[PDB]
Amino acid sequence: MLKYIIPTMMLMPLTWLSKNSMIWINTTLHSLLISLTSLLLLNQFGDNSLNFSLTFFSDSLSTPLLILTMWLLPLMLMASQHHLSKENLARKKLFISMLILLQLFLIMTFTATELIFFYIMFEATLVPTLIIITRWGNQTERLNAGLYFLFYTLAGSLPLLVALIYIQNTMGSLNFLILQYWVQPMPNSWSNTFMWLACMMAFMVKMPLYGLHLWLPKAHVEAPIAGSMVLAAILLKLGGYGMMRITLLLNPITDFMAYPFIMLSLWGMIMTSSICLRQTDLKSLIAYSSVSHMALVIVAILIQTPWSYMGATALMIAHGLTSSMLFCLANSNYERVHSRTMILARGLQTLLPLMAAWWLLASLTNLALPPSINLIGELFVVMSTFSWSNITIILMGLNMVITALYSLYMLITTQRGKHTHHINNILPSFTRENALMSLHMLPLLLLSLNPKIILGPLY
């Protein structure tokens, strides 16, 4: 793994001692070289996980998320100009280097052996995105956005530290094999319930669940595109992967104590699909869409079936791709017209004639068009939850109906029917945005061809 880590450190002074009108090509070129290098990772086989010696390993769950992350980085690094392509050279290098350091802590967080190393790199993943969205948030409440962001994520993520030091100093070291291979079932005390509540509630904050979901939408609509896509995709699915790690312990008590979290997740999935049917501020609809899909993920994690884990990881990776794409489209529309609202800039079927195809393809992979990976994830989650209970399928299909409803309402609202003929400033599409579209939707359909990769450790 350190051969997949140290060129990211050596990629940092590339941006510094690359001169003017030259940083862009060098950063994009070498991050794509890193994408090939990480595409060379996939070797994992059969019985065990793949150890990258003593500090590191990878399950077949961290591997697709890691390859997704290092593929998502050049997409973002090309995505993040035209709102800072006219700013200063030193601040531009600082921005790009902060993105690279952010990627470095993302890979550090996904490739962890010990949960203490995982927690340090977890809040190391936290800290740069704060600076990025607060400095370039481009709206008058980005202060409140970053403030709620850091305070919710620390104030929830903090008792996880105490619980992990407790598991450190009562049951040996914290290898995942040695957290495995040795864990005795801890019975139903109340202290076990508090420790389970600490760990699971910290990652509940990071998902978010329904009771803590207003963490998200300000930190998307008052944030630039780079921090938005990193935030949504890698941070929410990073919290999901963290719970997928830590849920191996405490099995005889999660049955008795995991009923209300399933409950808040289901009812919040329904109410969040309802809340993003009517709003303006187009950027926020994808944020509440992400809240709905992550509530579905949390139902899938807290029931403990291998079918549920396969559907969980498929839904994670497919929704990461879909949400990152659809955020990039909303960025393109806001760069066209500086409104951020929904009812104003209609039309756009006449003009931007092939951008409509990308809105269509993004809204249909958000619709769960059935050969895509998104319906694979949602389908196996529905199968496992109907095995869990015989009556929850009404809530799942009700989510499905309203999800199709708001996604296709987003499609036929902003880009269907009538130009308001006072806009009269938008230019036709650049090759850069369409290049980002072809960066988005070719890996999703290629994974739809060969999906035996992204299914989890319980393949």
């Binding site: 409440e141 409950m263 289901l266 501020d281 079918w307 500086h338 104003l344 199968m383 209970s389 009556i391």
Partner: protein, 128 residues
């Protein structure tokens, strides 16, 4: 002849049987004429800020921005926690949640007791 068209919050009241249009006063004429004057001044300012060949960007309607600022960030101020809002929040927020939690308790008690008795159809019930 006709039952005189009762209204509702769905059945809109048409322009024919108002019937309050037919109670013509100077007050209503002055109100309609000043309403026409308001829409006149607004359309004139729009057409002056609409037809210029140098004006590149959008029209920048302050009414739409006023509606968005009223709808998004003017929710939480202003507010006072009253009896009505608290009862409506606790009726719509914890009520149906404890309803679905009670019925999941019921279905899980039935399934647990039945498969503890062992009278389930699991001759082959593999994909759990």
């Amino acid at each position: 002849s006709f039952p005189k068209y009762e209204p509702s919050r769905l059945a809109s009241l048409p322009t024919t049987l108002d019937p309050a249009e037919y109670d013509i006063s100077s007050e209503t004429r002055k109100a309609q004429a000043e309403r026409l004057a308001i829409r006149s001044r607004l359309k004139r300012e729009y057409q002056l800020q609409y037809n210029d060949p140098s004006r590149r960007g959008v029209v920048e309607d302050p009414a739409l921005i006023r509606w968005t600022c009223a709808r998004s960030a003017n929710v939480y101020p202003n507010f006072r926690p009253n009896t009505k809002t608290s009862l409506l929040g606790a009726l719509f927020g914890i009520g149906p949640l404890i309803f679905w939690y009670y019925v999941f308790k019921t279905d899980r008690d039935r399934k647990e007791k039945l498969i503890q008795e062992g009278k389930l159809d699991r001759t082959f019930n593999i994909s759990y």
